[PDB]
Amino acid sequence: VRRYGRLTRATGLVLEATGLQLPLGATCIIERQDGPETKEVESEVVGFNGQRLFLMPLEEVEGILPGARVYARKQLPLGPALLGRVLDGGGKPLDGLPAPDTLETGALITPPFNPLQRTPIEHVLDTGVRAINALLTVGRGQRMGLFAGSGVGKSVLLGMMARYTRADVIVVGLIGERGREVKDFIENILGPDGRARSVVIAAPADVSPLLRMQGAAYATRIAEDFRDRGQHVLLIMDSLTRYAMAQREIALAIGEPPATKGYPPSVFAKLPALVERAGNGIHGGGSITAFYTVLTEGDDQQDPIADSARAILDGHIVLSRRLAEAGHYPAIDIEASISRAMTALITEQHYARVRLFKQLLSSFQRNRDLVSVGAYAKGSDPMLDKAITLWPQLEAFLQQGIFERADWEDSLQALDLIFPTV
């Protein structure tokens, strides 16, 4: 037995149901009769505003009859059974295998650690990426952003980290990415070794904005669960840009007006609340380190999503167009990226070499527009002499092949040889 309600109006995307009341954000089911049988169509309460129950379908609604019945009916699969699997925001398998054999589930919500109980970032996370490990050290429990436009190697970089980072588990949220790129990322970027050590939640661009939202919430809840079992997790969220776009579509459909770049206020309450769930746990246990991607429109630090992102993350790695078109991969712009936790994580012997790397790096690039003429009479500005001389070595220190693993030790060992006397 249940407490029904019924679908009164269906004049647009948002439906209206009467004789039922559920809290904002809740899975309401609308019945449609396929001849004699009965099938269920999922919807989500997007507003119980004193007027009626507003429903937004996660599915196709063709079939539903006027005054169709509606009722409530959330839990989701959680645990080791998720490893090597590819599910959607709801947990439905997307890889062909049968739903994970649970025996343990959980609400996608669940309260967060007080920003007090979290253990402070004190350990380095081996990203397996030399440039990051050496010049932008990432701590365990750090929240990083990856800023890149299309076509610069963002996906391939996420693939290197998903394959080499020294974590217990990797959970990848592919929110709003195009279907063929999702498929390509799972099959060609991650491979069989990357898949086996991770959990991939896919909610592609062509899917319901609600499913994309829920998809981001689900990958995060899974990382939280692994964290609660004492596991050190690497959370890859691709992309905050799409998570925000999803929220914009949902907010505009329910009347919320835009506040900034056409984005409603609620979008800026959703970003912080999402990344906030990542970060160290009460240590003795596990942690969550994460990378949140942000799409750059030909380089723009005016874009609100990007601006907002830079403000709540513990640093960020910028991928450069010019380094990409020039064959420089990973296309990491070291001058434009930073890691807040680095100096606290690395010895001064190491950090000294880092500052020096940045120095010789800058002096050679701006000056790279004046020496390709003959105007540079080498012998002056020793900084530049020790710049181009070591250049070929540093460009090759930065550059890393897709299947080359740059260990932490390997990275330092490599930096200690290009720079000083250990």
Binding site, annotated residues = 148-155
**Distant-in-sequence contacts of 253-262, Cβ < 8 A, 24+ apart:** 253/13, 253/14, 253/46, 253/56, 254/14, 254/46, 254/47, 254/54, 254/56, 260/304, 261/303, 261/304, 261/305
Tell me the residue ranges of DSSP E strands in 186-286.
198-203, 232-237
Residues 6 or more apart from 229 whose CB is under 8 A from it?
286
Question: What is the resolution in angstroms?
Answer: 2.4
List the one residue out of 24, 91, 378, 346 whose CA is nearest residue 225. 91
Rounded Cα–Cα distance for residues 134 and 389 (Å): 20
Rounded Cα–Cα distance for residues 240 and 305 (Å): 8
Residues facing residue 290 across a β-bridge: 143, 235
Rounded Cα–Cα distance for residues 253 and 255 (Å): 6
Buried b / exposed e over 123-162, threshold 16 CB at 10 Å, is bbbbbbbbbbbbbbbbbbbbbbbbbbbeebbbbebbbbbb
Instruction: Give the tokens for residue 342.
Output: 């680095």
Q: Are 309 and 291 in contact (CB under 8 A)?
A: no
Rounded to whole angstroms, the maximal C-alpha distance in the chain is: 90
List the one residue out of 46, 113, 81 whose CA is nearest residue 281. 113
Write down the H helix ranges in 313-407.
Answer: 321-325, 342-345, 348-366, 382-388, 391-398
DSSP letter string over 95-145? Answer: SSS-----S-EEES--PPPPTTTSPP--SB---S-HHHHHHS--BTT-EEE
Rounded Cα–Cα distance for residues 305 and 293 (Å): 11
By three-state DSSP, how is residue 72 classified?
A: strand
Tell me the CATH number for domain 1-422: 3.40.50.12240
Q: Are 22 and 53 in contact (CB under 8 A)?
A: yes
Binding site, annotated residues for ATP = 148-155
Q: Please report, as a single letter, which amino acid is at residue 277.
A: R
Q: Are 329 and 148 in contact (CB under 8 A)?
A: no
Residues facing residue 17 across a β-bridge: 7, 53
By three-state DSSP, how is residue 289 classified?
A: strand
Q: Are 26 and 42 in contact (CB under 8 A)?
A: no
Rounded Cα–Cα distance for residues 267 and 262 (Å): 10
Question: Rounded to 5 degrees, what are φ and ψ at 217?
Answer: -65, -35
CA atoms within 13 A on the CB side of 281: 18
Q: Please report, as a single letter, which amino acid is at residue 234.
A: L
List the one residue out of 81, 67, 74, 78 whose CA is nearest residue 45. 74
Experimental approach taken: X-ray
Rounded Cα–Cα distance for residues 19 and 351 (Å): 65
Residues facing residue 41 across a β-bridge: 30
Residues facing residue 214 across a β-bridge: none
